[PDB]
Design an enzyme around this catalytic site. Structure first.
Site, PDB file in Angstrom:
ATOM      1  N   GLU A 160       0.830  -1.194   0.000  1.00  0.00           N
ATOM      2  CA  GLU A 160       0.000   0.000   0.000  1.00  0.00           C
ATOM      3  C   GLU A 160       0.870   1.252   0.000  1.00  0.00           C
ATOM      4  O   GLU A 160       1.803   1.357   0.802  1.00  0.00           O
ATOM      5  CB  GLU A 160      -0.937   0.016   1.213  1.00  0.00           C
ATOM      6  CG  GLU A 160      -2.124   0.953   1.031  1.00  0.00           C
ATOM      7  CD  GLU A 160      -2.980   1.082   2.275  1.00  0.00           C
ATOM      8  OE1 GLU A 160      -3.747   2.063   2.367  1.00  0.00           O
ATOM      9  OE2 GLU A 160      -2.923   0.187   3.139  1.00  0.00           O
ATOM     10  N   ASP A 176       0.099   5.123   0.529  1.00  0.00           N
ATOM     11  CA  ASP A 176      -0.945   6.074   0.891  1.00  0.00           C
ATOM     12  C   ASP A 176      -0.477   7.450   0.471  1.00  0.00           C
ATOM     13  O   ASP A 176       0.096   8.195   1.250  1.00  0.00           O
ATOM     14  CB  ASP A 176      -1.261   6.005   2.378  1.00  0.00           C
ATOM     15  CG  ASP A 176      -2.080   4.771   2.734  1.00  0.00           C
ATOM     16  OD1 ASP A 176      -2.982   4.432   1.925  1.00  0.00           O
ATOM     17  OD2 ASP A 176      -1.808   4.143   3.789  1.00  0.00           O
ATOM     18  N   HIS A 225       3.467   1.823   2.902  1.00  0.00           N
ATOM     19  CA  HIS A 225       3.269   0.650   3.761  1.00  0.00           C
ATOM     20  C   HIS A 225       3.782  -0.582   3.030  1.00  0.00           C
ATOM     21  O   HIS A 225       3.072  -1.130   2.171  1.00  0.00           O
ATOM     22  CB  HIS A 225       1.805   0.406   4.103  1.00  0.00           C
ATOM     23  CG  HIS A 225       1.167   1.423   4.994  1.00  0.00           C
ATOM     24  ND1 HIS A 225       0.855   1.157   6.309  1.00  0.00           N
ATOM     25  CD2 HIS A 225       0.690   2.665   4.739  1.00  0.00           C
ATOM     26  CE1 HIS A 225       0.238   2.202   6.834  1.00  0.00           C
ATOM     27  NE2 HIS A 225       0.127   3.129   5.902  1.00  0.00           N
ATOM     28  N   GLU A 231      -4.022  10.846   2.655  1.00  0.00           N
ATOM     29  CA  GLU A 231      -5.061  10.651   3.659  1.00  0.00           C
ATOM     30  C   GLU A 231      -5.233  11.979   4.376  1.00  0.00           C
ATOM     31  O   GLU A 231      -4.273  12.491   4.967  1.00  0.00           O
ATOM     32  CB  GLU A 231      -4.696   9.532   4.644  1.00  0.00           C
ATOM     33  CG  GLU A 231      -4.689   8.155   4.008  1.00  0.00           C
ATOM     34  CD  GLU A 231      -4.430   7.028   5.006  1.00  0.00           C
ATOM     35  OE1 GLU A 231      -3.242   6.708   5.233  1.00  0.00           O
ATOM     36  OE2 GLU A 231      -5.405   6.469   5.565  1.00  0.00           O
TER      37      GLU A 231
END
Ligand SMILES: *[C@@H]1O[C@H](CO)[C@@H](O[C@@H]2O[C@H](CO)[C@@H](O[C@H]3O[C@H](CO)[C@@H](O)[C@H](O)[C@@H]3O)[C@H](O)[C@H]2NC(C)=O)[C@H](O)[C@H]1NC(C)=O
Ligand SMILES: OC[C@H]1O[C@@H](O[C@H]2[C@H](O)[C@@H](O)[C@H](O[C@H]3[C@H](O)[C@@H](O)[C@@H](O)O[C@@H]3CO)O[C@@H]2CO)[C@H](O)[C@@H](O)[C@@H]1O
Ligand SMILES: OC[C@H]1O[C@@H](O[C@H]2[C@H](O)[C@@H](O)[C@H](O[C@H]3[C@H](O)[C@@H](O)[C@@H](O)O[C@@H]3CO)O[C@@H]2CO)[C@H](O)[C@@H](O)[C@@H]1O
Ligand SMILES: *[C@H]1O[C@H](CO)[C@@H](O)[C@H](O)[C@@H]1O
Length: 437
Positions: A213, A215, A229, A218
């Site tokens: 992942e 990101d 991640h 966010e």
């Protein structure tokens, strides 16, 4: 899961831009689909729910393959039921949509290349840019744009039980190894289903769905973070029970993915006037967000850079002012120092750090756009002090929201018409999506 057609499935259209070295960009005609977990799940031969409320119908089917065979997901009423609309290159996701018989909370959506394929991106070495409006996104909400290593077809070619595919938003995974997915690996997650204690629509099954992942975004109008991640298995894989890790488990680090990431939040890194309502990056107005995934000479991910553009001025990412954590971009070395100064678990490091994230970024990843509230931590990890007694401790303060904010039932009741607008997606090599960085 099978696919049913009691409701036509028409993906709302969404254009985006592929850019070349030199600044020339070409319009691409894409679309978006909603994640299968928000869809109606009913028997293949009637409108009877296979899943309703927070329960499966286990008088009808009671194991993975048989429910996947006897149940299906159907089309989605994007605007009036899910509060999802598009216009040109613009996608608006509304928080709470109240219809005649139902109440929809949040949404997760994927960019499509075609009716049956997610638009895949290979990010390493490249540049991804988008515009976002978080102005109507307050404490406790998260409008998220990120990339995960799902398959382009939702898993159809891997799992014969998945006959719905990308068209119906199947195959999700991320670094939390989520166990609330109703279908994983083409099998219904009906075994050992436990209803959520605080989410009326949700539960967790025996299995979860893991993958790498990134990101990119966010955020709400109070706080923002971008966070790689890594996972020790790069692509989508099924995990079992507590060994899934993720936060809705007893040991969040026990699984194969890093559930925390190496995060950069301007506020958490010590600059409290950089991002917010009327700040340097003004969250009451549209923000251009630029992310560059730089390689070293060996071809590994060495650095993630962030730039913002507002009203034609390029704003480099804020300097982290935490003593010992100097810098304004994410590097392995920076992440080592960040985890050390904050006293945080080095799961990022243990699961392979930047190099392992870059292995995912080198491959194809799906673009997902979502809006949600947080039934575990009330988004306090994003926009408040977390842990709640940690004021003054480095890393605890992440935004100016009170520690009492973000309770889903409360924010759902008070700010139901919150919304996020993602628009103007641009992708290409470094320097290609915005001039003058
Ligand atoms: C949080 O990040 C902000 C943006 O990165 C940053 O704002 C910057 O503040 C400096 C003050 O040191 C401004 O510098 C101005 O003043 C100096 C000295 O007078 C001049 O030489 C400069 O050319 C400039 O005019 C920057 O203009 C300003 N940047 C922006 C984009 O507004 C904050 O300082 C950061 N806060 C902390 C605590 O680090
Ligand atoms: O079950 C049908 C029902 O689902 C509702 O959406 C659910 C999703 O099923 C669920 O996966 C999602 O879980 C998110 C949660 O809300 C967040 O706190 C956080 O944990 O991330 C999760 C997603 O990964 O929650 C929503 C809300 O319960 C639809 O709203 C509803 O219309 C639909 O009928
Ligand atoms: O993405 C789905 C899932 O995310 C959960 O939030 C995570 C964050 O993604 C993660 O970055 C954060 O990590 C922090 C950690 O919890 C703290 O120990 C801190 O010290 O370091 C990290 C920096 O933020 O943890 C949260 C909590 O799991 C949502 O809670 C969850 O609802 C959502 O589905
Ligand atoms: C039941 O249990 C959950 C576990 O996360 C709590 O957060 C909440 O109080 C719910 O009622």
């Amino acid at each position: 899961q099978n696919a049913c057609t009691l409701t036509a499935e028409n993906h709302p259209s969404l254009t985006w831009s592929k850019c070349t070295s030199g600044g020339s960009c070409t319009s691409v005609q894409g679309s978006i689909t909603i994640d299968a977990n928000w869809r109606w799940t009913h028997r293949t031969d009637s409108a009877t729910n296979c899943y309703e409320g927070n329960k499966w119908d286990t008088s009808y089917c009671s194991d993975g393959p048989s429910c996947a065979s006897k149940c299906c997901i159907d089309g989605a009423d994007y605007s009036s039921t899910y509060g999802i609309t598009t216009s040109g290159n613009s996608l608006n996701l509304k928080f709470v949509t109240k219809g005649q018989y139902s109440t929809n909370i949040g949404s997760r959506t994927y960019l499509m290349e075609s009716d049956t394929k997610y638009q895949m991106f290979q990010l390493l070495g490249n540049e991804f840019t988008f515009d976002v409006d978080v102005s109507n996104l307050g404490c406790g909400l998260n409008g998220a744009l990120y990339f995960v290593s799902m398959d382009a077809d939702g898993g159809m070619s891997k799992y014969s039980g998945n006959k719905a595919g990308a068209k119906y938003g199947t195959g999700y995974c991320d670094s939390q190894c989520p166990r609330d997915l109703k279908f994983i690996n083409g099998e219904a997650n009906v075994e050992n289903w436990q209803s959520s204690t605080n989410d009326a629509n949700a539960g967790t099954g025996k299995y979860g769905s893991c993958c790498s992942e990134m990101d990119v975004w966010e955020a709400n109008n109070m706080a923002a973070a971008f966070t790689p991640h890594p996972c020790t298995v790069i692509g989508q894989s099924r995990c079992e029970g507590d060994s899934c890790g993720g936060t809705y488990s007893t040991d969040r680090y026990a699984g194969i993915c890093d559930p925390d990431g190496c995060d950069f939040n301007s506020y958490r890194q010590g600059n409290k006037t950089f991002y917010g309502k009327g700040m340097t990056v003004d969250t009451t107005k549209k923000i251009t967000v630029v992310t560059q995934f730089l390689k070293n000479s060996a071809g590994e991910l060495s650095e993630i850079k962030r730039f913002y553009v507002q009203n034609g001025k390029v704003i480099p990412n804020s300097e982290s002012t935490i003593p010992g954590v100097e810098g304004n971009s994410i590097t392995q070395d920076w992440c080592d120092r960040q985890k050390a100064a904050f006293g945080d678990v080095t799961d990022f490091q243990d699961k392979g750090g930047m190099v392992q994230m870059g292995k995912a970024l080198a491959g194809p990843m799906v673009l997902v756009m979502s809006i949600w509230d947080d039934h575990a931590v009330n988004m306090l990890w994003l926009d408040s002090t977390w842990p709640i007694d940690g004021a003054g401790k480095p890393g605890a303060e992440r935004g100016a929201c009170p520690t009492t904010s973000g309770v889903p039932a409360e924010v759902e009741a008070e700010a139901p018409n919150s919304n996020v607008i993602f628009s103007n997606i641009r992708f290409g090599p470094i320097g290609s999506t915005v001039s003058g960085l």
